[PDB]
């Protein structure tokens, strides 16, 4: 689908509210496998199961290993920009 830019607002006591799978070592993108109800990703409205996360706050995740992506994603705070695409 079209590449989308999506804003997410997270408080410091919360996670992103997603589960991710995939990663470079598996030959697939970082993919959203779950959106957890009521948590920041669900609340932001623009992130969905099946979206590939191409970048977060300008950091490209297209060639990142699974655990690299976890570290990068979990470091982001506050107003967080995502670049995503549903394929």
């Amino acid at each position: 689908g079209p590449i989308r830019k999506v804003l997410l607002l997270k408080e410091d006591h919360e996670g992103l509210g997603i589960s991710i799978t995939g990663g470079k070592e598996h030959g697939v993108p970082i993919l959203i496998s779950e959106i957890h109800p009521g948590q920041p990703a669900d609340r932001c409205g623009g992130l969905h199961v099946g979206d590939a996360i191409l970048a977060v706050n300008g950091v490209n995740l297209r060639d990142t290993k699974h655990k690299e992506a976890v570290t990068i994603l979990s470091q982001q705070r506050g107003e967080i920009e995502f670049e995503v695409v549903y394929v």
Partner: peptide, 6 residues
């Protein structure tokens, strides 16, 4: 594949 809750 691995799954991480984040």
């Amino acid at each position: 594949w691995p799954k991480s809750i984040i």
